[PDB]
Design an enzyme around this catalytic site. Structure first.
Site, PDB file in Angstrom:
ATOM      1  N   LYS B 297      85.996 -50.455 -28.407  1.00 36.30           N
ATOM      2  CA  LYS B 297      85.370 -50.141 -29.682  1.00 36.30           C
ATOM      3  C   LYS B 297      83.853 -50.017 -29.508  1.00 36.30           C
ATOM      4  CE  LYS B 297      88.972 -52.431 -32.419  1.00 36.30           C
ATOM      5  NZ  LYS B 297      89.478 -51.144 -32.978  1.00 36.30           N
ATOM      6  N   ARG B 374     100.692 -51.498 -32.891  1.00 36.24           N
ATOM      7  CA  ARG B 374     102.037 -50.956 -33.014  1.00 36.24           C
ATOM      8  C   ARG B 374     102.906 -51.298 -31.801  1.00 36.24           C
ATOM      9  NH1 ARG B 374     100.007 -44.882 -33.381  1.00 36.24           N
ATOM     10  NH2 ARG B 374      98.252 -46.101 -34.225  1.00 36.24           N
TER      11      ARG B 374
HETATM   12  C1  4TM Z   1      90.993 -46.028 -33.668  1.00 30.61           C
HETATM   13  C2  4TM Z   1      92.429 -45.776 -34.138  1.00 30.61           C
HETATM   14  C3  4TM Z   1      92.516 -44.417 -34.828  1.00 30.61           C
HETATM   15  C4  4TM Z   1      93.364 -45.792 -32.929  1.00 30.61           C
HETATM   16  C5  4TM Z   1      92.853 -46.894 -35.091  1.00 30.61           C
HETATM   17  O1  4TM Z   1      93.422 -46.663 -36.159  1.00 30.61           O
HETATM   18  N1  4TM Z   1      92.539 -48.117 -34.657  1.00 30.61           N
HETATM   19  C6  4TM Z   1      92.891 -49.338 -35.388  1.00 30.61           C
HETATM   20  C7  4TM Z   1      93.162 -50.418 -34.330  1.00 30.61           C
HETATM   21  O2  4TM Z   1      92.277 -50.806 -33.570  1.00 30.61           O
HETATM   22  N2  4TM Z   1      94.427 -50.862 -34.286  1.00 30.61           N
HETATM   23  O3  4TM Z   1      94.737 -51.869 -33.303  1.00 30.61           O
HETATM   24  C8  4TM Z   1      91.912 -49.751 -36.321  1.00 30.61           C
HETATM   25  C9  4TM Z   1      90.601 -49.270 -36.307  1.00 30.61           C
HETATM   26  C10 4TM Z   1      89.669 -49.713 -37.257  1.00 30.61           C
HETATM   27  C11 4TM Z   1      90.041 -50.635 -38.237  1.00 30.61           C
HETATM   28  C12 4TM Z   1      89.173 -51.085 -39.153  1.00 30.61           C
HETATM   29  C13 4TM Z   1      89.570 -51.523 -40.370  1.00 30.61           C
HETATM   30  C14 4TM Z   1      88.592 -51.953 -41.182  1.00 30.61           C
HETATM   31  S1  4TM Z   1      87.197 -51.797 -40.345  1.00 30.61           S
HETATM   32  C15 4TM Z   1      87.855 -51.160 -38.932  1.00 30.61           C
HETATM   33  C16 4TM Z   1      91.348 -51.113 -38.245  1.00 30.61           C
HETATM   34  C17 4TM Z   1      92.273 -50.673 -37.299  1.00 30.61           C
HETATM   35 ZN    ZN Z   2      93.040 -51.794 -31.778  1.00 26.64          ZN
END
Ligand code: 4TM
Ligand code: ZN
Ligand code: 4TM
Ligand code: 4TM
Ligand code: ZN
Ligand code: ZN
Ligand code: ZN
Ligand code: ZN
Ligand code: ZN
Lengths: 517, 513, 519
Positions: B297, B374
């Site tokens: 990130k 997931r």
């Molecule tokens: C970056 C992406 C598109 C793969 C994604 O949806 N990531 C999730 C994540 O890391 N899942 O493990 C994601 C990204 C940002 C957030 C988020 C929510 C509120 S601030 C940042 C939450 C989930």
């Molecule tokens: Zn993640």
């Protein structure tokens, strides 16, 4: 009416094809119980196999030919299967000792096909029509389809088969030949016959919309688009009215007019009207976003992923409404009065452009603080919605390529509908089902309204915090409908077919089904 | 309990938890408003609106058994104030018995029926007065209309926002009494102790989420779950790496590879005393820190310093365990599940492009190591369906795209069974934790077809990532009713810089009703 | 007064300006605490602290001419409340004449010497007590030690923060908008503080006037409409005025300033206001404000994240401060001094007619300038204004400008930066910073960076190549246009806008005025 030019080579009109090859096709529908005559061109069987996945092909229809029947015995057809999208060509001689072409398309194992499934079938069928000079196609339905799905098959067939060559010059397809006859064999054909010419109407309304959208911004501009709308209205005997800048100023449409300030083309407000002969039970206003090109203005679309070269599509909403006007004006429904509206303009970068931070006044007297010039759609609809409400209608439905956030919520297949009235929303959803143009209901979340509170103006154009753009935009629009059932269809995600690199003409059939039923 | 590993001796080895809160010491009385109000002690606040007249004057209708306060509340004084939603005033004064009291109001707008968003505004305005109050009693007079659910919501929200989390810290005092005046008081009295239970379930989940990733890790979080199970007399089991390997949870274990903390799979069970008529599995995403892995990130807005909250789903499930184990419903069997791990950058981490095998046999091509939720859920869902339950509900901070679809207030629910979804939506209404039904669009499924593996973890193009993720998870539920609640956008209260403990009350209403 | 060009008839053709504000209707009375406090209608607020003891108990030490109120406010009754900075409480009671009165307090912390920032916290708490309460009077009892300047600063801030700008509201006007008509102040040695009252009211409006201009959007506040407002202000104050148009600007050969404006639909307007004393002039001063009515950035468009192109109406804040100072000076009428108020006003836009990155342009002193970035336009306009200023033959030149975004990384949002070529002048700016309580900090003009402005083709580069220390490099550039006159530069790009409150500060007005007056 006079399209301004920078140079003499600049186009002064949108090229529009009305008499398409599709219209020259004689379409006959026969009942399958009388057996199929296989004589000429290409005869395609639409076959499935319920239960058994990728199961064998069997032709259950009676075939009025000894030789062709023998060819299509289960023994010969066993080697091929019915996987959705599969197709095969066959070559043989008939009883008349003439060579004839036969084939099939796989419709899978499911008993009923969905929206995407039927389109898959049609796309396979069209691949059989391309690169093969045929004078006749025959389709034999050995699957079960209701009247709306049958009509959808035809519309989709006509739309995908049709190739737009308006802007081709030294590169026209030299092998472009269309069939002249279309035979259809189906069970209980009498009930399906009326769906043919309805489908041809629905086809052109959609293709017409498509023609406007695909037309680049140098051809399709606020003047040329409004000139085209007039021409359509004249051909359909619809009453029409085009509002120029001076009239727009008298109506005090400051939001609409501000957006168009930076353009070399004057704003043109399109107002077409259909009225049934006799008692009008329902009055409806259809509003379409008509940005002929969206550069973003001083908030220029420069960030990676902004797709500035696609932005000729930002009048897709208008195009849907005009396509609907064609359909409605052709089929002539009773007991309705329909207004087709579009505040058409161009969003450009100029010394004359409106700026981020400008406070502008809508025609209903609300002052608006512009936070982002690239959120120009909602500004033009605001004044269009105020105009619609003044017409004293029962329903206002707007359709617009409004927010890029739709790609993240629903994607490229489903459009979102927002609104202030559950009944209208359900009518929209119902029309979505019968038109087979998918729409999903999304909420107007009132907790976000406070983020559109402005320090100086009555209201903010855009939010900050909230990043839920499609919802915030719907919150903004709601402020410009005081007391009328209203709905908003965001087609930003579904208007352009990225895979096929062409418009879908999305919304024409949906809006027509809404008006008709 | 397992020994949580340390790098240095100063590293904490458990999550500090507050079970006994000042809120639990509040004595709550509910009086009928028809009889008039008593004002002799502490702070009295009137909830007031003015229908039709936007930002109209304050007018107090209730009769009060004090002459001094009656004069203060007369119309000519109160009309100097207005009812704009959230606006408040309060004054200190002597009553008839020469005792120091405080009297005021909170405006409730001009709409006769409050949304939960409106009610939260009211509560916030109230709590602000309480955080500068030293008096021992608060009395709230409802001169507005609320139903039983919203009234329970009012109490829950009040308890939750009133409480301040000082565990990590090295002008006011908590009240000892709460009085409520409201129409038909007798029918609301049964909501009070339910509100106190829903409060702690929500606040407990909040404590786990707010607990930083050095305090709250897979070992310490699973230890806490055990301790919760022990206090509630729930059956419990924690599965370690060896038994997870034997169960062949390749997706889950792959995410954890790069962490110094071993994976811990939490399984708590509530079983009713009587016959069991419904079996439910509740699954919570439990990433105690999401660095993103090698797909780090690093991008602007990725908010890596927030990612202690990536186990919010797990907290919601554990908080629900509290409420269920406390309220003790009948005829039900509930499993509380969470595949807990930490997603880190190491020589040992899983790599983008790695092909991993889930416990149901499916091979998964990892396209993005930050889509790790997931993967863990995939193995969790396979575990859940083997239990033979009627319902599987998972809740997870799964996709950032929720911020662009529903935003920070409404969660999204996806599923394979319309009946289960409607039950979730109904539970959203009675719990006042807002949720919207979003579609699983089958036309996007083809984007998950891998060239080499059985399936892709993510799409290359689709952009509709919340739906695509739902399609991925759907592949690991074969013949059980299943719904998926994406709380990525709603879990954290950005303005208040704290968790909402979102989902506790939603899930509890679901299993209770 | 010029005609404001329109694109559509709905385009506004002037800036709405509120001169007669409700603040001007407030009657202020100052009483000495020695005489005791009378408590009647309205709201009576005590400003209390507790030295050393953080969050210590409230004690009211002033004499109160009412047995009932005195009993209510006795030590035993107040000790449950604390003096935490910004804390406030409302009291309700009946007085000796059986009338109900409203009383209260604002906590002023545990430090006897309140900073200008902590005093703003006190005032904001006090303002929250004024809002949403239809009051006819407010009384303030000072039980803290304040000098004359901080007392005036209290009043200025009260007036400024109490005021609400509704010029652009149409359907969303606050229906409950009602202001006090009376303000009482109780303070020790009241006769020494009385002179500060009208000064504060003058400083308030000078500051508020600037704020109105800044907050005014660029479709309302453009070069023509802004110069027109400057004309109107001069006419009301009997100041001399001259607005220079493109034709005369061309004659004066202001190529740098003119090139910035080339892309705009609004012609350049150069503002020149003058105040002269009736007595013998003993010192001459020019005040120069940056006056970009909108800064899109030009062909170097503000499209980068965090560039806040929607805030760019603020880019005439320097001009606003100078015009605000013009109001104060023309009202207080200082003696033996001649002041010029200058602003090269224009709009930085994108157009077929815009000036391009790489263009070489000639300033009015004959220096050729190579343009490396069209968004560095402020220093170009200032260059010609500074040359113009020195030709007036003055003793001091002080400019004020939202010049560089780097200020947010150096001093942030509270302190402005001052640069200069003369130490005595800089000390005076710093001195006026103290007496106005508008925070400024001295920042260096580092000569070693000058070489990075060496152009290959022109006499000088507009922007540096290396550096990255933009505020200092920009100051180096500006210095090249002042030959032999004491000169100072105030960068207010960081302090101009109040991001939390979403409004302008009117920063610099009081600072510049104090500078003019105290010498
Ligand atoms: C970056 C992406 C598109 C793969 C994604 O949806 N990531 C999730 C994540 O890391 N899942 O493990 C994601 C990204 C940002 C957030 C988020 C929510 C509120 S601030 C940042 C939450 C989930
Ligand atoms: Zn993640
Ligand atoms: C840029 C933003 C977030 C303000 C936005 O929503 N823009 C709209 C827009 O330009 N409205 O006038 C937008 C952006 C991208 C699209 C889009 C849709 C399919 S590809 C790009 C559609 C609308
Ligand atoms: C980007 C650079 C170094 C050219 C600069 O200092 N720009 C100025 C500017 O545009 N002058 O014309 C600038 C940029 C941002 C701000 C700013 C201040 C508060 S938010 C943005 C102020 C000045
Ligand atoms: Zn746009
Ligand atoms: Zn657009
Ligand atoms: Zn995650
Ligand atoms: Zn600039
Ligand atoms: Zn600038």
């Amino acid at each position: 009416s006079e399209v301004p030019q920078v140079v003499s080579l600049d186009p002064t009109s949108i090229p529009i094809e009305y008499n398409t090859p599709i219209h020259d096709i004689k379409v006959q529908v026969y009942d399958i119980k009388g057996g199929c005559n296989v004589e000429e061109g290409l005869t395609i069987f639409l076959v499935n196999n319920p239960g058994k996945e990728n199961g064998p092909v069997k032709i259950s229809s009676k075939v009025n030919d000894k030789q062709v029947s023998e060819f299509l015995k289960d023994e010969n057809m066993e080697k091929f299967n019915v996987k959705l999208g599969t197709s095969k060509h066959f070559y043989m001689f008939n009883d008349n000792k003439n060579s004839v072409a036969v084939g099939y398309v796989g419709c899978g194992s499911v008993a009923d096909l969905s929206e995407a499934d039927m389109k898959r079938v049609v796309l396979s069928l069209v691949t059989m029509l391309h690169d093969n000079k045929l004078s006749k196609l025959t389709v034999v339905f050995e699957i079960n389809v209701d009247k709306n799905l049958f009509r959808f098959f035809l519309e989709t067939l006509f739309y995908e088969y049709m190739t737009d060559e308006r802007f081709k010059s030294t590169d026209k397809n030299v092998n472009m030949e269309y069939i002249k006859h279309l035979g259809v064999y189906i069970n209980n054909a009498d009930t399906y016959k009326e769906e043919v010419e309805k489908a041809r109407v629905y086809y052109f309304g959609t293709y017409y919309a498509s023609q406007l959208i695909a037309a680049p911004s140098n051809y399709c501009n606020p003047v040329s688009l409004s000139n085209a709308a007039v021409e359509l209205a004249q051909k359909l005997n619809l009453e029409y009215k085009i509002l120029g800048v001076k009239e727009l100023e008298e109506l005090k449409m400051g939001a609409y007019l501000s957006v168009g300030k930076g353009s070399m083309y004057p704003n043109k407000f399109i107002h077409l009207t259909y009225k049934s002969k006799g008692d009008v039970k329902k009055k409806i206003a259809l509003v379409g976003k008509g940005i002929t090109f969206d550069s973003g203005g001083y908030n220029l679309k420069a960030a990676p992923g902004s797709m500035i070269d696609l932005m000729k599509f930002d009048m897709s909403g208008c195009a849907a409404v005009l396509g609907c006007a064609y359909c409605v004006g052709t089929l002539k429904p009773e007991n309705v009065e329909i207004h087709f509206l579009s505040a058409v303009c161009e969003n450009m970068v100029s010394k004359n452009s409106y700026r981020p931070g400008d406070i502008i006044t809508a025609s209903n007297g609300k002052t608006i603080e512009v936070g982002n010039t690239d959120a120009e759609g909602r500004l033009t609809l605001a004044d269009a919605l105020v105009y619609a409400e003044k017409l004293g209608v029962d329903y206002i439905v707007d359709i617009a390529t409004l927010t890029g956030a739709m790609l993240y919520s629903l994607g490229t297949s489903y459009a979102g509908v927002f609104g202030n009235n559950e009944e209208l929303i359900n009518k929209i959803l119902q029309s979505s089902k019968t038109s087979n143009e998918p729409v999903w209901w999304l909420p107007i979340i009132n907790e976000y309204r406070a983020t559109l509170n402005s320090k100086y103006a009555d209201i903010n154009q855009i939010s900050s915090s909230v990043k839920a753009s499609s919802i915030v935009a719907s919150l903004f629009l709601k402020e410009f409908v005081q007391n009328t059932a209203w709905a908003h269809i965001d087609i930003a995600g579904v208007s352009w077919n990225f895979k096929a690199r062409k418009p879908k003409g999305f919304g024409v059939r949906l809006l027509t089904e809404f008006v008709l039923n």
